[PDB]
């Protein structure tokens with residue numbers, strides 16, 4: 010009766026991106042092929058509640074999660090969250106064919122130890138049979154992915170504090186690929202291009218090269234928009250909130266562009282340039298067809314122009330909601346201005362439709 | 364721990380297999396974000412008396428046709444979505460004990476569903492979905508059950524096995540129609556989400572009217588009239604067999620008297636067919652008009668049949684084309700697909716189930 014579809018298959022999940030400085034919620038639905046944004050909200054975190062990709066203050070995250078639900082105003086209580094790909098170990102091993110799912114699980118629990126740095130008791134294991142081994146029909150190819158149990162369990166607890174349940178623990182790299190596939194309109198078929206996605210966060214910048222939809226390269230750096238925030242704080246005597254608000258609202262003195270924003274803009278360019286060079290010297294690729302700017306920092310005025318000017322590669326700000334429709338309860342202007350920072354959240358929400 | 368998704372979920376694309384009374388249709392779709400693509404497509408006629416009405420009679424005959432439709436389609440997919448007719452499915456909402464798991468619920472549902480379903484206890488296939496807490500009593504839950512005869516599932520399951528195919532999903536044809544209809548938004552000049560459309564599927568031995576309001580089916584009527592009538596009229600008049608007459612219909616090498624004595628009278632009979640069925644639906648509810656009439660089925664490819672119906676009923680009419688906004692695989696014959704499009708609605712809808 011598992012095959013029965015006498016009842017129409019009818020199951021959406023919240024896209025919840027937990028970063029170092031904020032919590033982002035996105036809810037999607039679709040009618041045929043066209044997607045629609047049901048709900049959206051962003052909540053700042055208490056400082057040092059989430060350092061790096063690691064949750065430290067559990068209650069602080071839970072509170073942030075609780076409040077972001079209210080502003081989004083949605084009914085959904087199940088969500089998709091993600092761990093960093095840097096925290097996941099992936100390995101392809103071969104196993105005996107003809108094993109049941111339980112037998113396969115038992116063997117993989119015991120032998121995972123042999124394929125993972127982590128101690129055996131602290132590991133969350135995910136697996137997938139790929140098919141029969143090419144060499145030998147007696148064996149199957151098994152994909153194995155592991156991370157420390159702590160990473161899953163801490164996010165479990167964090168969502169629980171907001172009454173939320175993680176139906177799926179995704180990997181940020183996968184979420185990026187899903188939302189990037191929607192940029193095909195904004196770009197030619199995303200299915201035939203080589204594209205450098207530069208996610209410029211607050212404290213973290215990440216280059217992700219995608220060829221025909223699949224990630225083929227990833228590099229990270231401790232560079233981000235907080236650098237711009239801290240320089241506004243220092244020059245004008247503002248707190249983190251005031252300075253962050255000042256970026257968007259633009260109420261700063263005349264010397265802001267030349268003394269603060271442009272030097273930061275240049276640091277962004279140098280950062281992007283070095284990362285591309287690292288990628289070119291890492292494989293067959295000599296060039297990318299496009300650079301897609303992502304993260305809140307990508308909304309900096311004419312940052313895309315500057316990168317085009319200094320690098321010579323077509324650059325645009327990510328907007329996964331270009332073709333989508335909107336619920337009347339969603340602010341079109343707010344979403345549009347925050348669009349490049351919602352790539353991960355959108356990709357997490359797209360996991361509902363896989 | 365099935366929350367884990369450390370490995371990316373992928374690769375669950377299913378063949379759309381539309382089994383009718385006279386043919387088997389295969390369609391394979393892929394996706395690139397939201398944009399769909401036609402990967403594979405083939406059509407194989409069925410041996411006579413293999414499928415009468417919606418009932419499979421010659422199992423080996425359907426299996427063999429399925430084997431042959433695979434070769435022509437040239438696909439590596441071995442999993443498929445097949446459908447039963449909605450007339451074979453009963454839908455009922457019943458009230459059950461709360462706190463029971465789904466597995467717990469299914470076992471007990473065998474005993475409880477019997478009172479409400481017109482099928483034998485040991486001969487029924489039951490699908491169910493919990494809706495939520497009962498309004499009458501929050502200690503109980505409302506459960507939607509949909510049932511059909513076990514045989515309808517098993518025979519299509521066996522037919523596919525004979526061709527090395529697996530039925531991963533047994534869909535309902537009405538659901539398949541809704542999925543492919545949602546794609547007509549472009550050609551219809553309006554969003555499928557806000558529109559009222561009467562879909563007239565004119566098959567070989569059957570015509571079916573389906574009214575869709577904002578994307579959902581709110582009415583369905585069917586009759587045993589179809590393109591075989593045209594074929595049977597060609598058979599007798601010119602002394603041609605089923606194959607020759609059916610081939611002549613599309614190719615049309617026929618004698619000058621074909622248009623006035625056979626083709627046009629059939630055109631008019633179709634109009635009479637569509638006309639009555641619409642009046643049935645208007646007199647069945649608030650609706651006094653439909654915005655569009657969508658012609659589906661192979662018989663809908665009769666030239667200017669859409670214009671005739673539009674003029675004689677007064678409602679905008681077009682021939683269904685679910686592949687308008689789709690890229691095509693290089694191995695797929697663009698011309699053949701274009702001419703067979705209105706007959707591929709169900710097959711397209713079945714393949715779209717891969718993405719639900």
Ligand SMILES: Nc1ncnc2c1ncn2[C@@H]1O[C@H](COP(=O)(O)OP(=O)(O)O)[C@@H](O)[C@H]1O
Pocket residue numbers: 028029030031209210211212213233234235238253256257303304305306307308309310346350
């Ligand atoms: N319109 C904007 N202009 C400039 N900077 C912005 C804008 N919107 C957001 N930011 C910056 O984006 C940074 C946060 O980026 P985001 O990717 O959304 O979170 P994270 O960096 O934690 O992943 C903050 O430093 C904020 O100052």
Ligand SMILES: Nc1ncnc2c1ncn2[C@@H]1O[C@H](COP(=O)(O)OP(=O)(O)O)[C@@H](O)[C@H]1O
Pocket residue numbers: 383384385386565566567568569590591594609612613660661662663664665666702706
């Ligand atoms: N181009 C065409 N012109 C006229 N009739 C056609 C054309 N193509 C197919 N037909 C007729 O349409 C019928 C096929 O209907 P179809 O929907 O494919 O069958 P079913 O749904 O009953 O399996 C056949 O009787 C065929 O003669």
Ligand SMILES: [Mg+2]
Pocket residue numbers: 028210353
């Ligand atoms: Mg981020």
Ligand SMILES: [Mg+2]
Pocket residue numbers: 477478479480481482
């Ligand atoms: Mg009964």
Ligand SMILES: [Mg+2]
Pocket residue numbers: 383566567660709
């Ligand atoms: Mg049909």
